[PDB]
Amino acid sequence: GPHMATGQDRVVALVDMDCFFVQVEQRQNPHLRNKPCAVVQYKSWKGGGIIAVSYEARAFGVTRSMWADDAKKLCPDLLLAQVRESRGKANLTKYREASVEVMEIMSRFAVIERAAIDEAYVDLTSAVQERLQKLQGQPISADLLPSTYIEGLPQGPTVQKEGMRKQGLFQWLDSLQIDNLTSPDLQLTVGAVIVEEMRAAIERETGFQCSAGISHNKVLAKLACGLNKPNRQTLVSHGSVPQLFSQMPIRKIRSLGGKLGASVIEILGIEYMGELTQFTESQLQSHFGEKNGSWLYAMCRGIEHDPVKPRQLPKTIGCSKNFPGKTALATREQVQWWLLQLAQELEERLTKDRNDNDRVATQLVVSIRVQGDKRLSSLRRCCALTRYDAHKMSHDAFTVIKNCNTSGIQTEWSPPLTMLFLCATKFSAS
DNA sequence: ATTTTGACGCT
Ligand SMILES: [Ca+2]
Ligand SMILES: [Mg+2]
Ligand SMILES: [Mg+2]
């Protein structure tokens, strides 16, 4: 009752660039705009692996992870842009730099947590308070929310998508109590106004469109963001949670898409997030551990406390390459040459990072996979990263991994290596 | 033969 927390203390948004690598390539090459197109890495093996797909091409069934040759079977007019290749490997610099463009714009509005190359959480609580004080009891016009969906509306006593969107927004705004500045629904609504402004600024200043979710925590904001894509934003209120979760597969909630969510489904014999409400906190802790159990107990009620962390920059800078099938590295010279390629890309990115961001990495992590091992990484070792020098870093990585070679032959490497991975970590201010 | 990333939890 009067003491039960409701998780309505913050306004949190999640902003997600639509088909991001595709938009970067479409901005650069106008011939690709408004066409079925995809971004592909490499080209020799089956036309290359697709890593991003425009919504026009998704309509044909083209997906990420698909080989371009197969996608062309679904979509014969599919246009393709290739990721740059440098030093023998795919090089993602263009997309990292485009990401910085967008994150710097978002940071003008509020504190952001970089969640991936194309998405960030936004803590809007303070910005909403200030905007509410500026408004001075003035109602919020639908014109301030031209791309916003209110999840769960319209309801109760038009057959077009935009007409439905507007009907629901009208019902929401008609019900709103705009004179209580502490009202969580009003706070979410002002948050959505700010996110419309943020998304307009991103599009004006970069050309890139994005979607967004606005709710009271990160998990609900992330879920909301996916409800109406592309180029739209969705407000998920606390009150919408019971209906939304009542048919929501557990795997759709962030962190439950893998083994833990599978165990929740199997052990409890349920399918939907809302079904979790029927268990006590102790029951859930008994099955899934103290932390996970408490988290699930709160989350199925719409409540999550994970903070938006103030972190706009990645914590690690890494470079990796797979060597599948017959290309697995089987000689020492091969291993050393590719460690050098990876180390040279790493040195370039690290020097740029030091100049831009006033920090230096202090640890070098070396990871390899051996042929036959099902795990993505077979071995991980660390060593000191004391100089931004590619020859030193590659020599050090070889030193820490050279004892993995079973081969009694000096020149040969066995078992063959199917993956090399160098990662700079443990940054310190510089 | 997806590939190339990135963050965080466990012990
Ligand atoms: Ca995206
Ligand atoms: Mg995606
Ligand atoms: Mg994303």
Write out the two tokens for A379: 């071995």
What is the Cα–Cα distance from A196 to A189, expressed in whole angstroms?
11
Report CA(A289)–C1'(B11) in Å, whole number: 15
Report CA(A260)–C1'(B8) in Å, whole number: 15
Ligand 1 center from residue A298 Cα (angstroms): 27
Contact A353, A317 (CB under 8 A): yes
Ligand 3 center from residue A210 Cα (angstroms): 10
Angle, to 10 degrees, between the axis of helix A290-299 and the axis of helix A281-288? 140
Report CA(A49)–C1'(B5) in Å, whole number: 15
Contact A369, A352 (CB under 8 A): no
Write out the two tokens for A51: 């890593």
Method: X-ray
Decide: helix, strand or coil at residue A22: helix
Convert A26-58 to b/e letters by CB count within 10 Å (16 or more is b): beeeeebeeebbbbbbeeeeebbbbbbbbebbb
Q: Resolution of this PDB entry, in A?
A: 1.9
Ligand 2 center from residue A19 Cα (angstroms): 7
Report CA(A279)–C1'(B11) in Å, whole number: 29
Counting ligands in written order, the one closest to the CA of A116 is 3
Amino acid letter, A198? M
DSSP code per residue over A281-332 = HHHHHHHH-HHHHHHHHHHTTT--------B-S-S-EEEEEE--GGGSEEEH
Contact residues for A148 (Cβ-Cβ < 8 A; gap 6+): A165, A169, A192, A196, A232, A233, A234, A235
Contact A38, A80 (CB under 8 A): yes
What is the Cα–Cα distance from A165 to A162, expressed in whole angstroms?
5
What is the Cα–Cα distance from A277 to A139, expressed in whole angstroms?
36
What is the Cα–Cα distance from A74 to A403, expressed in whole angstroms?
47
Alpha-carbon separation of residue A46 from A16, A42, A70, A129 (angstroms):
30, 9, 8, 54
What is the Cα–Cα distance from A77 to A16, expressed in whole angstroms?
27
Alpha-carbon separation of residue A191 from A171, A188, A223, A427 (angstroms):
18, 5, 16, 34
Question: If residue A251 lies in a helix (H) or strand (E), which one and from where to where?
Answer: none
Q: Are strands A119-123 and A12-17 parallel, antiparallel or unpaired?
A: antiparallel
Nucleotide nearest to A113 (CA to C1'): B7
Taking alpha carbons only, the member of A203, A232, A233, A207 closest to residue A221 is A233
Decide: helix, strand or coil at residue A187: helix
Contact A342, A349 (CB under 8 A): no
Counting ligands in written order, the one closest to the CA of A211 is 1
Q: Which nucleotides of B are covered by protein (CB under 7 A)?
A: 1-10
